[PDB]
Amino acid sequence: PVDFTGYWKMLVNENFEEYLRALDVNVALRKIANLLKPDKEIVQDGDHMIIRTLSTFRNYIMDFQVGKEFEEDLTGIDDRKCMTTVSWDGDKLQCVQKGEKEGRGWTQWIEGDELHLEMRVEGVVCKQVFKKVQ
Structure with a gap:
């Protein structure tokens, strides 16, 4: 129903260190992650x-069909593998990442001209917000 296609620049990044720690990312890699302002480049067709x-530093690529469970390789983040499903929730995208960590996933939606992303694992919540450059 929504088309997320765009190059979205990061404006907001809350609790990212807390999220990476809950994935057991070591302290040096968390230190560099503090420098980063990752952008979202999205292409969508249905x-x-x-x-x-x-x-x-490092990109992370996701390439998927909504509604199709797939083996997600999170090499570069925590190098785990998850049984992952992205699903439509109205205009929102809901991702469940099944694997070692409980409650791992995310929600992505657009409010106005803002891309919103909430990343979750073990009850830690990271809030990110992005905007296209007008």
Whole structure:
């Protein structure tokens, strides 16, 4: 129902250190992650989506069909593998990442001209907000 396609620049990044720690990211890699302001480059065609999380350090690429469970390789983040499903919730995207960590996933939606992303694991919540450059 919504088209997320765009290059979205980060404006807000709350509790990211707390989220990476809950994934057992070691202290040096958390130190550099503090420098980063990852952007979202998204291309979508219907239920097919590529979400490229771009940073000067390391990118993370997601490439998926909404509603199709897939083996997600989170190499670069915590190098785990998850059984992951992205689903439509109205205009919102809900992601459940099944694996070692409880309650791992995220929610993505657009409010106005703002891309919103909440990342969760073990009850830690990271809030990110992005905007296209007008």
